[PDB]
């Protein structure tokens, strides 16, 4: 499992935003600490906050960072164009025997044009490929800013993240984002479920598409 | 300073093996657990491995274990991982970072090293398989739908789609492939057409893996 983290988090020159870090009973109500790095486009990641709430020494006071039950959260005063990185929590899970566990990343980003919600088309798996022995959910995903998204899979109710495919967000030619996920199953598991879903998770946006046999 | 410098990775096929090390220095090395946590591209951060100071305590992430080897020699301030089995969906950035000390609660990684790429790729060509996606207004404006070719399991990049014969441009958008996780690449290619021409216009997609030599022309009807 993994700490749950906004996509995309931003803001105009000198906002305060904050970032959420949503975990459960086994890793941050289990009795450990959050931590927080940021991690500078195209560097390896820093340390930003460790022990829920202490700065290393270098890090501004802009930065703040709390714990409060099975959530964390990092607020960062006077947002700036130093600030734009991706940021990851991190705590520690007694599941499995133990592991360190990482949040999902979040995506800081100074406006430099309004946010866009992108648009989400959902396609079943064709009938030519069932007849192959296979089955492939085609989730596009396009003209979305800033260009950061979540996509979740679920079988009827239930969350699948076996045989998910996601990409990274490309820039469309008008200057938007653009993302693709596909969903693989057998086709027994097509057949045999009510419905599967893909969520698209944006800023202040969910959009869920469903497709049934 | 404290310094950790990542090196050993490499380009290797799936079943290959890889060494990496990390040569610390600025600390005293024998006095800190050490750790190698990845990054796949355009990915999160996945913790790897854990050994303790003086090596009495091994861990690994369920992903690697019985593959990955991770030891230390705190003679030569050096961290290892013997890389196993390697498999596409390893391929990642590897740091190396140190956990800090910590009264409780689970410490923190104090210290970060720039990475070493681990690129993990069969160099064997794959031509496509192409499938219909049927036509669906649900997600489209009034009186138009959506009808698109997926273009699987190919390598390498890149394939060309066409739609008609290049024909139809209007409200083509072919999305950039998935590397998936089995080192092979997916994409769709998806074209908004008005409604009322589904029953009479004909809509081929024309895929060109040039790499393999493979042609497939598709045509995608309603259902």
């Known amino acids: 499992s993994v700490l749950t983290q906004p996509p995309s988090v931003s803001g105009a020159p000198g906002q305060r935003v904050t970032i959420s870090c949503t975990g459960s009973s086994s890793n941050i109500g289990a009795g450990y600490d959050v931590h927080w790095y940021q991690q500078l486009p195209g560097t390896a990641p820093k340390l930003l906050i460790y022990g829920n709430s202490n700065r290393p020494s270098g890090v501004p006071d802009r930065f703040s960072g709390s714990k409060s039950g099975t959530s964390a959260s990092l607020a960062i005063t006077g947002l700036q164009a130093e600030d734009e990185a991706d940021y990851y929590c991190?705590?520690?899970?007694?599941?499995?025997?133990?592991?360190?566990?990482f949040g999902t990343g979040t995506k800081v980003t100074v406006l430099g044009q309004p946010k866009a919600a992108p648009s989400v088309t959902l396609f079943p798996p064709s009938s030519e490929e069932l007849q192959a022995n296979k089955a492939t959910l085609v989730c596009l995903i396009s003209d979305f800013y800033p260009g950061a998204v979540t996509v979740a899979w679920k079988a009827d109710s239930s969350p699948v993240k076996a045989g998910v495919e996601t990409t990274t967000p490309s820039k469309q030619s008008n200057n938007k984002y653009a993302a693709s996920s596909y969903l693989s199953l057998t086709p027994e598991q097509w057949k045999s479920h009510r419905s599967y879903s893909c969520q698209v998770t944006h800023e202040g946006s969910t959009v869920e598409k469903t497709v049934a046999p | 300073e404290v310094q950790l410098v990542e090196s050993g990775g490499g380009l290797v096929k799936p079943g290959g093996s890889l060494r990496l090390s990390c040569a610390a220095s600025?600390?005293?090395?024998?006095?800190?657990?050490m750790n190698w946590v990845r990054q796949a591209p355009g990915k999160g951060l996945e913790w790897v491995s854990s050994?303790?100071?003086?090596?009495?305590?091994?861990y690994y992430a369920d992903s690697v274990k019985g593959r990955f080897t991770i030891s230390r020699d705190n003679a030569k301030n050096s961290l290892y991982l013997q890389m196993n089995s390697l498999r596409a969906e390893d391929t990642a950035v590897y740091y190396c970072?140190?956990?800090?000390?910590?009264?409780?609660?689970?410490?923190?990684?104090?210290?970060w090293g720039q990475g070493t790429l681990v690129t993990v790729s069969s160099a064997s060509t794959k031509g496509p398989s192409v499938f219909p996606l049927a036509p669906s207004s649900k997600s489209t404006s009034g009186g138009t739908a959506a009808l698109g070719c997926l273009v699987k399991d190919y390598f390498p990049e890149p394939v060309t789609v066409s739609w008609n014969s290049g024909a139809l441009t209007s409200g083509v958008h072919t999305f950039p492939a998935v590397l998936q996780s089995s080192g092979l690449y997916s994409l769709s290619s998806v074209v908004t057409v008005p409604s009322s021409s589904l029953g009479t216009q004909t809509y081929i997609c024309n895929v060109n893996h040039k790499p393999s030599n493979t042609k497939v022309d598709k045509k995608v009807e309603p259902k």
């Open positions: 050994i303790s100071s003086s090596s009495s305590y091994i």
């Open positions: 991190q705590s520690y899970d007694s599941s499995l025997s133990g592991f360190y566990v």
């Open positions: 600025g600390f005293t090395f024998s006095s800190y657990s």
């Open positions: 970072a140190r956990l800090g000390y910590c009264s409780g609660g689970s410490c923190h990684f104090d210290y």
